[PDB]
């Protein structure tokens, strides 16, 4: 298929497949395409899919100028670990 955005609520299977400012997550029902998020917000630096048993990831990278950091929450201890966004 041909460059698909995103408008959030549009099907994705790229690593982007969205607006120039969206970025394409993982959901329960279907993968869709959700816009980019900012500092308070979960970040993603670290994303291990393939093997069998495996847990969704339903987040987006940081807005431009934001800078991923960790974050101790109770929540990674489903499997990964959670982080967050600062505006640098």
């Given at each position: ?6 408008h959030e609520g549009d099907p994705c299977l790229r690593s982007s497949d969205?607006?120039?400012g969206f970025c394409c997550a993982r959901h329960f ?60």
């Open positions: 298929m041909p460059h698909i955005k995103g969205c607006i120039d029902w279907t993968k869709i395409c959700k816009p980019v998020l900012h500092q308070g917000e979960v970040c993603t630096k670290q994303r291990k899919k393939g093997s069998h048993g495996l847990e969704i990831f339903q987040r987006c990278d940081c807005a431009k100028g934001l800078s991923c950091k960790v974050w101790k929450d109770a929540t990674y201890s489903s499997k990964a670990r959670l982080h967050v966004c600062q505006k640098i």
